[PDB]
RNA sequence: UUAGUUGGGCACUCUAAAGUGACUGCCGGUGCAAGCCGGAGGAAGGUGGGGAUGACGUCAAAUCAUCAUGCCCCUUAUGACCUGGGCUACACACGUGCUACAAUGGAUGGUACAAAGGGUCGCGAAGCCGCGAGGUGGAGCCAAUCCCAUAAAACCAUUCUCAGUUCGGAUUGUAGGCUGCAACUCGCCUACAUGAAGCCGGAAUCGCUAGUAAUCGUGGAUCAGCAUGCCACGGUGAAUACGU
RNA sequence: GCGAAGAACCUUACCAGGUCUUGACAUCCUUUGACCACUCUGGAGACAGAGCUUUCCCGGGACAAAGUGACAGGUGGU
């Protein structure tokens, strides 16, 4: 519908949240400058009003655009031989978090108990 | 300086050790200033940065601008336990 | 229309000083308003009791400041002279406005 | 081994609306994190639902349910000969009401409706008709005592 | 290394944030209260002697 | 023409004043249903006027500060009970029978070092 | 009067010095007595609640690194100065905590009620600017006067409607804010985006007997900046004890 | 969540490299008595090199630069 098929039972804000690159306040601003209320469900949208939603969303980076941008951002750090590139390659915390214990979102589930 | 005081470069590193390497600039610069921001005019030269023991030579590329001079000289060594 | 603030670490010598000031002001002057007890202020200092170990064994010390306020309404030269010529005890701090 | 004897007992207050101590004990048993007002309003709303549906005052319905879910026999552990066995025992009045209220709240929190007022009201109505989760909890307790008599 | 430490702490630092505090009786760096300039141990013993005015053992 | 009482509960203190009238309760220059929007708190506040049969003969104007809303209500109740006690000596048994003249003495205890509260102790492990 | 503001008054709260008050003192039962169970009066009843207070001794218990000290070692170095790094490493195991796994809840709007503390090379108001962290501005204060200072849970409306979700917030990308000579290793905070595990936890194990446990915020020391830790303060406020 | 009531530099006791030797810190000795602070040049800094420079007071004293010991100095061990 709008880049992808957002849910049809929910409000417009919460459904728009399902697009990559749109959260909550960006959805509110979209529906604010799009001349559309936000308590109307997704089923009850018209064609012109949903078309204004489409027209509005073309000026924001969403889905593969952002994925390519962030992948290039990580790749540059990896390939200029920085510290953050080393951390990205080894799968260790990139910010200054401590790794003596308890860094599991990066290291995955607790590996082989030695 | 992560603010609007301007960027930070240590004066002894830049003043006439970087702006002075304009003619026949084909030699390394030894420095202990790990804390200096890599300016756009740093690019082309190779700087030797102290890591705690030794001077590691880093050749400033185009994508290193805005980073700290010490990001490219790791201090701790670790090889797979 | 004359303010005096007295502050000390104990209320006995300060009580004596305040009562003496009131007595002298009454003798050499005309009027005085009784000493108003301002709230005392206490500060607490918690310190580890051991020299090396033992976080859970501690000791509290405290420090209290006691205050009084006095007003003379009918100021006369004798009252001011007598009040300024008093010799209050050491440890009692006087402030005249 | 020490304990120096029987102790005093707590003295609860009658509820400001339904002038009974047992309503207060139910409200206390539903309390969480020292929030008296929330459970108190929840109980008032549940009794409103009861009065609306059944059509009679909620107090006699509540008393019928509690009389219908209070236990008589219970299983207690006895250690003899190096082995522990379950044995029958009879509850006092205080323990009788305590177990009744405990089971009522425990099995009212485990129902499947949207709110808590509805869950409490439905549990009470079920207990008033010898049906529900709290009713069977005292059925097996009667059963468990007999099988070890 | 203790007299050198005390002498360096007394000297004016190269930068303002270089400066730190030490107990004035024993040159101790940690646990220095700065109303008294005393570490906790010297504070306790001088308070027991009765040589810190106003302070007394707190019962409350 | 004014009967005065002072109530206290926890850190709350209330100046209750009682004047013949219609039944108008005033709390801090604010209405007593606007100040107290619940109902059981109003019941506990008007317990002293219900114990004796003098509920609607009086107006109470109160001035409370300190503590929280239940402390507000307890202080108000104690103050109005003492004011009624001032009105007539013969009210003394009834107000004593319900324990409405006792000033509640239990106040929040003291944090102790080595503990996380007044009595709560850290988690213990042998090894 | 925008207002306890101004006039005026200590009536009431409050502040703080000195007193009074509780002792099984009186009544009934029980006992040879001590004592035990109930009752009156009283704000308070059985050392009312809580602190400080740690006898004789035990563990060659801890600390030569707060301090001091016998003996033994170094003395162009085991002393002294400096810049950079490290104490923050990471296959893993244990201890103590914080945040959740949602409807007694999430988001949005409205709106009440504290105590104890800190402030002069310090606290820092109003007004203006910013989505926000903040910036600017300089009032009043050596303070029962002025500032920190918005209390938060609670309560009232609208919405969500049982969904790994309008739960949960880790992790990562970009743009910023402050302190500081300097924020890469390695500070804290903000905005937008991203949206992991997690459905109440196995054998087992811990705290707590009443304004306690549980839960919600607040202040302080250290401190240029940095706490989910420590030390204190109040708001709401239980269940149970047959027994050895 | 123990010393630590605050490890970016300092704290810091550890490591690498660069420097010092009556000494960073005390008493006495021998000459001088106010030395320090400041500007510029080199250096990562400690440190070196030139100028303006240091105003003790009433033989006393505490400060102060030079050279030399007697000595200092150890968060070194138990
Ligand atoms: Mg980095
Ligand atoms: Mg980063
Ligand atoms: Mg960290
Ligand atoms: Mg780390
Ligand atoms: Mg960690
Ligand atoms: Mg660690
Ligand atoms: Mg480590
Ligand atoms: Mg762990
Ligand atoms: Mg991580
Ligand atoms: Mg291996
Ligand atoms: Mg301390
Ligand atoms: Mg100590
Ligand atoms: Mg211990
Ligand atoms: Mg003790
Ligand atoms: Mg009990
Ligand atoms: Mg209540
Ligand atoms: Mg020493
Ligand atoms: Mg510091
Ligand atoms: Mg009023
Ligand atoms: Mg008011
Ligand atoms: Mg009024
Ligand atoms: Mg008003
Ligand atoms: Mg109060
Ligand atoms: Mg204590
Ligand atoms: Mg603790
Ligand atoms: Mg512990
Ligand atoms: Mg264990
Ligand atoms: Mg009082
Ligand atoms: Mg009695
Ligand atoms: Mg108490
Ligand atoms: Mg006592
Ligand atoms: Mg030993
Ligand atoms: Mg032992
Ligand atoms: Mg041992
Ligand atoms: Mg040992
Ligand atoms: Mg030694
Ligand atoms: Mg020693
Ligand atoms: Mg040690
Ligand atoms: Mg040692
Ligand atoms: Mg030490
Ligand atoms: Mg490493
Ligand atoms: Mg804790
Ligand atoms: Mg918790
Ligand atoms: Mg959320
Ligand atoms: Mg709200
Ligand atoms: Mg308030
Ligand atoms: Mg206050
Ligand atoms: Mg502070
Ligand atoms: Mg504050
Ligand atoms: Mg506050
Ligand atoms: Mg999921
Ligand atoms: Mg992160
Ligand atoms: Mg950083
Ligand atoms: Mg850092
Ligand atoms: Mg966000
Ligand atoms: Mg992703
Ligand atoms: Mg899962
Ligand atoms: Mg679920
Ligand atoms: Mg246990
Ligand atoms: Mg006990
Ligand atoms: Mg809690
Ligand atoms: Mg919370
Ligand atoms: Mg909090
Ligand atoms: Mg808390
Ligand atoms: Mg706080
Ligand atoms: Mg705090
Ligand atoms: Mg701070
Ligand atoms: Mg904390
Ligand atoms: Mg934090
Ligand atoms: Mg906590
Ligand atoms: Mg017991
Ligand atoms: Mg602990
Ligand atoms: Mg550490
Ligand atoms: Mg260093
Ligand atoms: Mg020696
Ligand atoms: Mg020996
Ligand atoms: Zn000391």
How many other CB atoms are there within 10 angstroms of residue F81's CB atom? 26
Q: Which helix (H) or strand (E) holds D65?
A: helix D58-69
Spatial CB neighbours of D103, under 8 Å, sequence gap ≥ 6: D69, D134, D137, D138
Classify residue C89 by its DSSP letter.
Answer: P
**Among A80, A84, A86, whose Cβ lies nearest the Cβ of B64?**
A80
Yes or no: say if D100 and D24 are a contact pair by the CB < 8 Å rule. no
Question: Taking the alpha carbons of A71, A77, A80, A85 in that order, is the dihedral positive or negative?
Answer: negative
Say if residue A108 is exposed, middle or buried (CB neighbours under 10 Å; 0-12, 13-18, 19+): exposed
Burial of D34 (0-12, 13-18, 19+ CB in 10 A): exposed
Cβ proximity of F42 and F32 under 8 Å:
yes
For the CA of E15 and the C1' of H53, the distance in angstroms is: 26
F11 is in an annotated binding site: yes
Q: Output phi, psi for A85, to 5 deg.
A: -65, -40
Q: How far apart are CA B41 and CA B46, in angstroms?
A: 12
d(C-alpha D14, C-alpha D25), whole Å: 9
Residue A114, both tokens: 């030695």
What is the distance in angstroms between the CA of the first residue and the CA of the last residue of chain A? 51
Report the C-alpha gap between D111 and D101 in whole angstroms: 16
Residue with tokens 């200096």: B36
E2-CA/H5-C1' distance, Å: 22
Q: Specify the experimental method.
A: cryo-EM
Answer whether D34 touches F (CB < 8 Å): no
Residue nearest to nucleotide G161 (CA to C1'): D114
Which residue from F20, F81, F16 is spatially nearest to F52, judged by alpha carbons?
Answer: F81
Whether the Cβ atoms of residue F94 and residue F17 lie closer than 8 Å to each other = no
Residues A86, B74: C-beta atoms closer than 8 Å: yes
Nearest Cα residue in chain E from C60? E58
Enter the tokens of residue F94: 């009834």
Alpha helices in chain A (DSSP H): 12-16, 25-33, 47-57, 64-79, 83-90, 104-107
Residue listed under structure tokens 């009850």: A44
Closest listed residue to residue B31, CA positions, set B13, B4, B6: B13
Is C45 among the annotated ligand-binding positions?
Answer: no
Question: Residue F127, CA: closest nucleotide via C1'?
Answer: G95
Can you tell me whether residue F19 is helix, strand or coil? strand
Residue nearest to nucleotide G83 (CA to C1'): B32
Between β-strands C2-8 and F3-9, what pairing exists: parallel, antiparallel or unpaired?
unpaired
What's the reported resolution, in angstroms, to a tenth? 3.0
Residues 19-38 of B with CB under 7 A from strand G: 32, 34-35
CA of F116 to the centre of ligand 70 (A): 9
- Yes or no, beta carbons of E54 and C63 under 8 Å apart: yes
Spatial distance between the Cα atoms of D43 and D36, rounded to a whole number of angstroms: 11
Q: Is C59 annotated as a binding residue?
A: yes
Q: How far is the CA of A97 from the centre of ligand 73 (A)?
A: 14
Q: Is the Cα torsion angle D28, D29, D35, D36 positive or negative in sign?
A: negative
SS3 C32: coil
Nearest CA-CA partner of C46 in F122, E46, F117, E57: E57
Closest among B28, C47, F74, F84 to E41, alpha carbons compared: C47
Tokens 């009713």 identify what position? D135
Q: For residue B13, give Cα distances in angstroms to A92, B52, D30, F89.
A: 32, 18, 71, 93
List bases, strand G, within 7 Å of protein CB.
12-18, 41-44, 48-53, 62-63, 65-67, 79-97, 103-105, 112-115, 117-118, 143-144, 151-156, 159-162, 166, 170-174, 176-188, 191-196, 205-215, 221-224, 230-244
| Cβ atoms of residues F91 and F25 within 8 Å | no
Taking alpha carbons only, the member of A43, A11, A42 closest to residue A28 is A11
Select from F13, F30, F110, C4 the least CA-distant residue to E59.
F110
Q: How far apart are the first and last CA of chain F?
A: 72
The order of strands in the sheet holding B46-50 is B29-31, B46-50, B55-59
Return the SS3 of A20. Answer: coil
In angstroms, the Cα distances linking E11 to A47, E8, E16 are 78, 5, 12
* Pair type for strands C93-96 and C2-8: antiparallel
């Amino acid at each position: 519908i709008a880049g992808v098929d957002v849910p049809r039972e929910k409000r417009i804000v919460i459904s728009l949240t399902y697009i990559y690159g749109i959260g909550k306040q960006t959805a509110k601003e979209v529906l604010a400058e799009a001349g559309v209320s936000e308590d109307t469900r997704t089923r009850d949208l018209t064609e012109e009003e949903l078309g204004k939603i489409r027209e509005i969303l073309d000026r924001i980076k969403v889905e593969g655009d952002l994925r390519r941008e962030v992948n290039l951002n990580i790749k540059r750090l990896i390939e200029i031989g920085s510290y953050r590139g080393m951390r990205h390659r080894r799968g260790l915390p990139v910010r200054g978090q401590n790794t003596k214990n308890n860094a599991r979102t990066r290291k995955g589930p607790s590996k082989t108990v030695a | 300086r992560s603010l609007k005081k301007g960027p930070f470069v240590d004066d002894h590193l830049m003043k006439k050790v970087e702006a002075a390497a304009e003619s026949e600039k084909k030699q390394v610069i030894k420095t202990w200033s790990r804390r200096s921001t890599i300016f756009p005019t740093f690019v082309g030269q190779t700087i030797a940065v102290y890591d705690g023991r030794k001077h590691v030579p880093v050749y400033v590329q185009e994508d290193m601008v805005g980073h700290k001079l010490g990001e490219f000289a790791p201090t701790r060594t670790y090889r797979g336990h | 229309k004359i303010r005096i603030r007295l502050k000390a670490y104990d209320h006995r010598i300060l009580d004596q000083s305040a009562e003496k000031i009131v007595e002298t002001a009454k003798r050499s002057g005309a009027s005085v308003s009784g000493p108003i007890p301002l709230p005392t202020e206490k500060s607490i200092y918690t310190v580890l009791r051991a020299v090396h170990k033992y976080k859970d064994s501690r000791e509290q010390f405290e420090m209290r400041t006691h205050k009084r306020l006095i007003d003379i309404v009918n100021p006369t030269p004798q009252t001011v002279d007598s009040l300024m010529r008093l010799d209050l005890p050491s440890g009692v701090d006087i402030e005249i406005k | 081994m020490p304990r120096k004897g029987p102790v005093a007992k707590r003295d609860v207050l009658p509820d400001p609306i339904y002038n009974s101590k047992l309503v207060t004990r139910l409200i206390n048993k539903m309390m969480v994190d020292g929030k008296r007002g929330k459970s108190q309003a929840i109980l008032y709303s549940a009794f409103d639902i009861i009065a609306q549906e059944t059509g009679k005052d909620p107090m006699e319905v509540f008393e019928q349910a509690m009389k219908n879910i209070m236990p008589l026999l219970e299983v207690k552990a006895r250690r003899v000969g190096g082995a522990n066995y379950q044995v029958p025992i009879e509850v006092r009045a205080d323990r009788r009401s305590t177990l009744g209220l405990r089971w009522l709240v425990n099995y009212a929190r485990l129902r499947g409706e949207k709110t808590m007022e509805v869950r409490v009201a439905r549990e009470i109505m079920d207990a008033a008709n010898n049906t529900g989760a709290s009713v069977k909890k005292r059925e097996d307790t009667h059963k468990m005592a007999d099988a070890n008599r | 290394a203790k007299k050198s430490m005390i002498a360096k702490q007394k000297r004016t630092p190269k930068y303002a944030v270089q400066a730190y505090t030490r107990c004035e009786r024993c040159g101790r760096p940690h646990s220095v209260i700065r109303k008294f300039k005393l570490c906790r141990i010297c504070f306790r013993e001088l308070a027991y002697k009765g040589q810190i005015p106003g302070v007394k053992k707190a019962s409350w | 023409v004014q009967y005065y009482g002072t109530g206290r509960r926890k850190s709350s203190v209330a100046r209750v004043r009682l004047v013949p009238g219609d039944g108008k309760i005033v709390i801090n220059n604010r209405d007593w249903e606007d100040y107290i929007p619940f109902a059981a708190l109003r019941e506990v506040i008007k317990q002293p006027l219900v114990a004796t049969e003098t509920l609607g003969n009086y107006d109470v104007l109160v001035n409370v500060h300190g503590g929280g809303y239940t402390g507000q209500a307890g202080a108000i109740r104690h103050g109005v009970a003492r004011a009624l006690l001032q009105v007539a000596p013969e009210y003394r048994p009834a107000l004593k029978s319900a324990g409405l003249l006792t000033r509640d003495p239990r106040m929040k205890e003291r944090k102790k070092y080595g503990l996380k509260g007044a009595r709560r102790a850290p988690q213990f492990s042998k090894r």
